[PDB]
Amino acid sequence: GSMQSTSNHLWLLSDILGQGATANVFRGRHKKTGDLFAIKVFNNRPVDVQMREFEVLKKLNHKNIVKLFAIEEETTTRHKVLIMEFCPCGSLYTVLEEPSNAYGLPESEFLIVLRDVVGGMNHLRENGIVHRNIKPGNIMRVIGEDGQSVYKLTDFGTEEYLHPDMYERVLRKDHATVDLWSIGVTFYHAATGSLPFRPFEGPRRNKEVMYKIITGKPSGAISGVQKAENGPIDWSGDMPVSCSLSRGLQVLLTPVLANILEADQEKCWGFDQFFAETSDILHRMVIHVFSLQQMTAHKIYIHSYNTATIFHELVYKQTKIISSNQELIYEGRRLVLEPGRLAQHFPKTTEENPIFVVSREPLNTIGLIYEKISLPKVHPRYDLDGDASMAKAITGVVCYACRIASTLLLYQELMRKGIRWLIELIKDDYNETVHKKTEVVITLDFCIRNIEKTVMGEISDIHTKLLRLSSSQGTIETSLQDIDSRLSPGGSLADAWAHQEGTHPKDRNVEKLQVLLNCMTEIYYQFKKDKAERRLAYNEEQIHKFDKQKLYYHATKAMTHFTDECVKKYEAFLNKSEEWIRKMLHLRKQLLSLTNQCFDIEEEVSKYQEYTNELQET
Amino acid sequence: GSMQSTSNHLWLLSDILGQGATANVFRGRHKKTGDLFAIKVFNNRPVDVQMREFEVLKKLNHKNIVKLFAIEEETTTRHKVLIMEFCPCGSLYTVLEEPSNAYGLPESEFLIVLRDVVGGMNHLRENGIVHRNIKPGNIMRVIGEDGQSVYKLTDFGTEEYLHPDMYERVLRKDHATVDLWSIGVTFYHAATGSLPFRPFEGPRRNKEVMYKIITGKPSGAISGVQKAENGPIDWSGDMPVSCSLSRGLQVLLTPVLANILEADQEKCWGFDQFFAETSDILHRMVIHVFSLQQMTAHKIYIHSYNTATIFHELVYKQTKIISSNQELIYEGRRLVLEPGRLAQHFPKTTEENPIFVVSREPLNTIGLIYEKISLPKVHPRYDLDGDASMAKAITGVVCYACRIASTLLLYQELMRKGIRWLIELIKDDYNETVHKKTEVVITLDFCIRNIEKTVMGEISDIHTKLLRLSSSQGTIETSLQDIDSRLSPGGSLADAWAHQEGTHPKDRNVEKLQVLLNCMTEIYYQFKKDKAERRLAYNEEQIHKFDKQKLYYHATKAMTHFTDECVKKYEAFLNKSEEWIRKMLHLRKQLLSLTNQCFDIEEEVSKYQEYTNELQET
Ligand SMILES: O=C(NCCCNc1nc(Nc2cccc(NC(=O)N3CCCC3)c2)ncc1I)c1cccs1
Ligand SMILES: O=C(NCCCNc1nc(Nc2cccc(NC(=O)N3CCCC3)c2)ncc1I)c1cccs1
Ligand SMILES: [Cl-]
Ligand SMILES: [Cl-]
């Protein structure tokens, strides 16, 4: 294999990173240092319209823009090459081909994409550049020095991403929102793993159904899918259920998408509003909350400067528990947020260490809501392109199952923890009120009896009325004994079942699934190599056919384990939780009542304390 | 490349897994399924001494023994091949070459190795086989179906691992412990990343110093290292400081090693005792405990059936806090273990969620104790063998730094959590005693004054003596106000500094280090490839020299970040903890005193309650 070069760099033609009509991108090295760079080489005026536009870029300096170092002359010809920042990881496209992201990026990653695309976008605009076609292949990923992805825009100056006016194909007239469209599609694709507008078959074969979908899209819809050949379009303003993003994030993103995926440029958002709206999301912090009675996890997207009041409102939006019914638990103890306490001063939370919320009012136990996705059928006919894409799809289904199994395990672990804490909490209450009582029994038994016992009627009415109180306290004692016994080891309120039901970390169900998944992923990546390599030799051919069966046998094993082990035991744990919750609410409601009687007893005794002493002559 | 085969399998000669004097091991496939297997082929009597010993093995069935499926005839010759279980991961040797394990295996992995080596060993013995030479290259690793390693013995029937009698080289006379020796060396190597007996330079060049080390080893020593040329030997009965294993595990393992690394076979352990002793370790569960005043994490190795009593004893061994001074905290609240409560019923713990222990008695704040390891110098002379081994070594140092930085971050995170909990705990105490007090003030202010106020001396002495009590309670009130103000936001006992000092997860120091480490590890693995490939072409040669500089620049960047950021801020946080601890102990000791006065007041008032009422004529 051989190489072109310039004064300072050199590169294999085999080591190509990208191909456009205008130019090609290879990875090469600086000859003096050995350092990796992307070399952009143009295949072809006016001569200096380019040296100028090249110069403008060489000046651009920004975190979210692939850097243009220098411009050089290839040695063989006086052709211009651009030396650009090499990004070993590739593009957002590469990321979304990972079977792991078949149903959307992980939330944190999606947020980085959102941030960086928006940042790069702005920078161009600030400098007045318009990037006509933003798409995942345009958006380069790099590992930052802190290990987090940094996304970077390159190649400024695809059907599925072109605006309706653009899809037709008259140079856009005279000047951007059209950019917002492809950003709209890009973000949706990153959020869900899918293109938002999908004629049956492909957009490619059905360019016409596709334009009909995009133009005739009702307002608010963010997707339209044709599920059958020549069938109708299903519209939605919602994220698909299979999407990983939290309800907290979904609720914020959806409106941004609806408003930048608008056909009439009359009512598109306009950039600034888009910048303002996206930044409002990006500037929020996340507080993790888990709803114990609903068996649901939540992310609350809240500004640093927002109050607890707003926090309760946000929680209410996702749970339907009104502010005043919201009872908070954190790290074993009650959390009491003063209304005006800023979110920046709330205690630190994670998905594994959330703030729990409980109500004294009945809620339906929801649990995790997820798509039921079954394996596609494997087509026995051998095909290097077909099998690669099928391998991707089936591995995608198993990863999803794996992701859901992990969430299912988390939900049960949080439940077990939440329940443990709440029981010790109720237990405190029982002891707080059981103290008070013994402390007021002290007045009946010590004062009224013993005080007036010391030496016409009303007195006959007082000693007897008081007896009704000790009588009333006796009704209290036996109702507390009943609650204590319920809170104890034998009790109807016991923890035990939660250790007996569902699945536990030590079961290693997630790990068992990942092992199977890793087997499928090696095969998928090989089918990726088998595709690129256009024909296999006899043995390799056979081996490829074998592994096509192995994929399926691995995928079936996984789905069976998922449904019969993970889902089954999970549903058993949930149904038991439903019952334990109802008993708990009823118990707390009795104890409350026993607590209020204690106050009502306590204060009448607090009146007759004085009645012992009359005025005296003197 | 071409292949031998048999009726049912075939294999490249390039795809070799192992080479001994007697035979070779390649990886091949079943021709009908495509499945991977290890093919052992013998290079050479009596003819059937072998078909018999082959048959014995084909019968062996055990989790920790590489499985022998069948015996077949190679096609070209009637030579015998063994078809064996293929283990894609390789051997314990491969694992210990990973720069990640330069200073020993992670604790969990070490325990699996221990378990599996012991299990396989026993199985052979149960069947009466003796494996003369156990070593990491003998011990095969496989990923189990739950994702955990399973280790498996193969090749039954190295200098560094041979017993002193064996090192000499008379067929061992007539018959095992000699096996125990190599197990001794193997476990030590797995625990520390190093051979226990090391002449300066290598064992290879110094076969003679090596035998002198092993034979002249004082009893109890588990290692002897010659650190200078012709220098003396440093002996130890302890694990090196750089070893990852917990003190809890070290304390148990060390005696096993001392007793199976014994020269006089008179006083070696003998297998059964070894089996009993190792199993005693393997059958223990681990309870994670964190000592708040010492800033130390601990693993308590305890049987399921052991009592809390034993638990306290074990904790005392590692902390020097006697049982009765041990105060336990778990998930925000006090933990009170009944003496006879079984460890199996203790609450579940992890390193991130330990039981905290505190004392009311002063302890030195120790923190984490770790080796200071600096980068070796990089030798500028180009050498494919030399550079590979150097790349390994320098990457090993950085991984260690990374491992320590992670532990350092954990220790600070646990401190912050522990302190948070303890403060709410002390806070409870303040409120428990501040209740009691107001509850007894009720008797002074309500009863004695008001009771005898109602209508010769001693009475003159009582009203005045009582005044000394309200007087005494007034001394109490202002001392509580003082403690409350200390426990509040302004207080000398505040949390604030802990958020201001040390390093936090959001700093991403561990991630910054891993990124650097990953760069070094790609280079190391390439130098591994450059070594195997005996000479590099001019460019590759240059590129290899460049990256040899890149390693160093990456390693320096890492060490600088480690010492100047991780270690520095950590040491600042620790020094502040030292001070906060002392204030806390002093505060708790005052509150205790204020709590006891409250009892002493409370009970004298409890006597004069009766003194109000004399006997009456009637
Ligand atoms: O698209 C284009 N330019 C941007 C992309 C090519 N440019 C660069 N690439 C990288 N590094 C890099 C590393 C690994 C993989 C890849 N790419 C892929 O894996 N891909 C591409 C989509 C098919 C999958 C790229 N560094 C810097 C650049 I500048 C162009 C199209 C037409 C003209 S320029
Ligand atoms: O040592 C020996 N037999 C046991 C080892 C060879 N046998 C097997 N190997 C594997 N799989 C496997 C996979 C990847 C790597 C490797 N090995 C290595 O990476 N190594 C070897 C130490 C040098 C590093 C092995 N499967 C099954 C077997 I059976 C022998 C020595 C002399 C005769 S037999
Ligand atoms: Cl480009
Ligand atoms: Cl072998």
Query: Could you give the angle at the alpha carbon of B348 between the alpha carbons of B346 and B350, nearest 5°?
Result: 130
Long-range contacts of A587-593 (CB under 8 A, 24+ apart): A587/A426, A587/A483, A587/A486, A587/A487, A587/A493, A588/A360, A588/A426, A588/A429, A589/A360, A590/A479, A590/A483, A591/A426, A591/A429, A591/A430, A591/A433, A591/A483, A592/A360
CA R_g for chain A? 34
Same fold, B283-362 and B382-618: no
Q: Hey, are the CB atoms on B148 and A511 less than 8 Å from each other? A: yes
A23 Cβ closer than 6 Å to some ligand 1 atom: yes
> B122-147: b or e for each residue (b if 16 or more CB lie within 10 Å)?
bbbbeeebebebbbbbbbbbbbbeee
Q: Which two tokens stand for residue B158?
A: 């190295």
Q: Are residues A399 and A100 in contact, defined by beta-carbon separation less than 8 angstroms?
A: yes
Residue A463: enclosing H or E segment and its boundaries? Answer: helix A458-487
Which of B11, B89, B145, B615 should be substituted to probe chain A, the one whose Cβ sees the most A Cβ atoms within 10 Å?
Answer: B145
CA distances from B373 to A273, B242, B359, B513, B562 (A): 55, 9, 34, 16, 11
With 0-12 CB in 10 A as exposed, 13-18 as middle and 19+ as buried, what is A598?
A: buried
> What is the distance between the alpha carbons of residues A494 and A501, in angstroms, rounded to a whole number?
13
User: Pairing between strand A223-226 and A197-198?
Assistant: parallel
Half-sphere exposure of A331 (CA within 13 A, CB side): 20
Residue B84: enclosing H or E segment and its boundaries? Answer: strand B80-85
> What is the distance between the alpha carbons of residues A41 and A56, in angstroms, rounded to a whole number?
18
Bridge partners, B297 (sequence order): B290
> What is the distance between the alpha carbons of residues A290 and A329, in angstroms, rounded to a whole number?
10
Is the preceding omega at residue A380 within 30 degrees of 0, hence cis? Answer: no
DSSP 8-state assignment for residue B39: E
DSSP 8-state assignment for residue A489: T
Place of tokens 């033609």: A13
> What is the distance between the alpha carbons of residues A45 and A51, in angstroms, rounded to a whole number?
10
In sequence order, the 6+-apart residues with CB closer than 8 A to the CB of B68 are B54, B57, B58, B60, B82, B83, B84, B85
Q: Are residues B566 and B499 in contact, defined by beta-carbon separation less than 8 angstroms?
A: no
Place of tokens 């019969």: A564
> What is the distance between the alpha carbons of residues A319 and A307, in angstroms, rounded to a whole number?
19
Residue type at B376?
Answer: P
Please state which CATH number belongs to domain B3-86.
Answer: 3.30.200.20
Please state which CATH number belongs to domain A87-282.
Answer: 1.10.510.10
Per DSSP, the three-state class of A84 is strand
Using what technique was this structure determined?
A: X-ray
For chain A, the structural domain boundaries read 3-86, 87-282, 283-362, 382-618
Single out the residue of A516, A515, A476 nearest to residue A601, CA to CA: A476
Torsion angle (degrees, nearest 10) of CA B482, B486, B489, B493 = 180
Strands (E), B336-390: 355-358
CB atoms within 10 A of CB A538: 7
Q: How far is the CA of B26 from the centre of ligand 2 (A)?
A: 8
- Among the partner-chain residues A332, A512, A613, the one whose CB lies closest to the CB of B332 is A332
Closest residue, chain A, to B428 (C-alpha): A333
Q: Are residues A410 and A571 in contact, defined by beta-carbon separation less than 8 angstroms?
A: no
Tell me the CATH class for A283-362.
Answer: alpha beta
> What is the distance between the alpha carbons of residues A88 and B339, in angstroms, rounded to a whole number?
59
> What is the distance between the alpha carbons of residues B140 and B152, in angstroms, rounded to a whole number?
5
CA distances from B580 to B299, B411, B479, B577 (A): 25, 16, 20, 5
> What is the distance between the alpha carbons of residues B478 and B472, in angstroms, rounded to a whole number?
11
With 0-12 CB in 10 A as exposed, 13-18 as middle and 19+ as buried, what is B180?
A: buried
Q: What is the DSSP string of A15-33?
A: SEEEE-SSEEEEEEEETTT
With 0-12 CB in 10 A as exposed, 13-18 as middle and 19+ as buried, what is B368?
A: middle
In sequence order, the 6+-apart residues with CB closer than 8 A to the CB of B478 are none
Single out the residue of B336, B545, A302, B511 nearest to residue A312, CA to CA: A302
Category of A26 on φ-ψ map: left (φ > 0), alpha (ψ -120 to 50) or beta: beta
Q: How far is the CA of A191 from the centre of ligand 1 (A)?
A: 22
> What is the distance between the alpha carbons of residues B194 and B566, in angstroms, rounded to a whole number?
27
Closest ligand 1 atom to the C-alpha of A24?
33
Torsion angle (degrees, nearest 10) of CA A472, A475, A476, A477 = 120
Q: Are residues A251 and A259 in contact, defined by beta-carbon separation less than 8 angstroms?
A: no
Residue B300: enclosing H or E segment and its boundaries? Answer: strand B296-302
CB atoms within 10 A of CB A301: 19
> What is the distance between the alpha carbons of residues B513 and B555, in angstroms, rounded to a whole number?
9
Torsion angle (degrees, nearest 10) of CA A292, A294, A299, A305 = -70
A137 Cβ closer than 6 Å to some ligand 1 atom: yes
Pocket test of ligand 1: the residue of A26, A140, A158, A525 to mutate, having most ligand atoms within 8 Å of its CB, is A140
> What is the distance between the alpha carbons of residues B90 and B103, in angstroms, rounded to a whole number?
20
Residue type at A461?
Answer: D
CB atoms within 10 A of CB B68: 21
CA nearest ligand 2 atom 13, residue: B90
Q: How far is the CA of A23 from the centre of ligand 3 (A)?
A: 9
CA R_g for chain B? 34
CA distances from B83 to B7, B73, B582 (A): 12, 10, 67
> What is the distance between the alpha carbons of residues B544 and B353, in angstroms, rounded to a whole number?
45
Place of tokens 């070593």: B135
> What is the distance between the alpha carbons of residues A281 and A278, in angstroms, rounded to a whole number?
5
CA nearest ligand 1 atom 11, residue: A87
- Among the partner-chain residues A145, A424, A512, the one whose CB lies closest to the CB of B146 is A512
Which of A416, A436, A515, A613 should be substituted to probe chain B, the one whose Cβ sees the most B Cβ atoms within 10 Å?
Answer: A515
Structurally, at CATH architecture level, domain A382-618 sits in Up-down Bundle (1.20)
> What is the distance between the alpha carbons of residues B192 and B167, in angstroms, rounded to a whole number?
23
Per DSSP, the three-state class of B181 is helix
Q: Are residues A525 and A600 in contact, defined by beta-carbon separation less than 8 angstroms?
A: no
Is the preceding omega at residue A489 within 30 degrees of 0, hence cis? Answer: no
Q: Hey, are the CB atoms on A512 and B147 less than 8 Å from each other? A: yes
> What is the distance between the alpha carbons of residues B557 and B601, in angstroms, rounded to a whole number?
65
In sequence order, the 6+-apart residues with CB closer than 8 A to the CB of A314 are A248, A300, A301, A302
> What is the distance between the alpha carbons of residues A307 and A287, in angstroms, rounded to a whole number?
13
> What is the distance between the alpha carbons of residues B248 and B302, in angstroms, rounded to a whole number?
10
> What is the distance between the alpha carbons of residues A601 and A473, in angstroms, rounded to a whole number?
8
With 0-12 CB in 10 A as exposed, 13-18 as middle and 19+ as buried, what is B472?
A: middle
Per CB distance under 8 Å, which residues of A are interface residues toward B?
A: 29, 33-34, 143, 145-148, 331-333, 417, 420-421, 424, 439, 454-455, 508, 511-512, 514-515, 542-543, 546-547, 613, 616
Residue type at A264?
Answer: D
CA distances from B77 to A76, B46, B198 (A): 57, 18, 45
Closest residue, chain A, to B614 (C-alpha): A454
With 0-12 CB in 10 A as exposed, 13-18 as middle and 19+ as buried, what is B343?
A: buried
Place of tokens 């590992």: A143
> What is the distance between the alpha carbons of residues B566 and B415, in angstroms, rounded to a whole number?
16
Single out the residue of A127, A133, A218 nearest to residue A167, CA to CA: A133
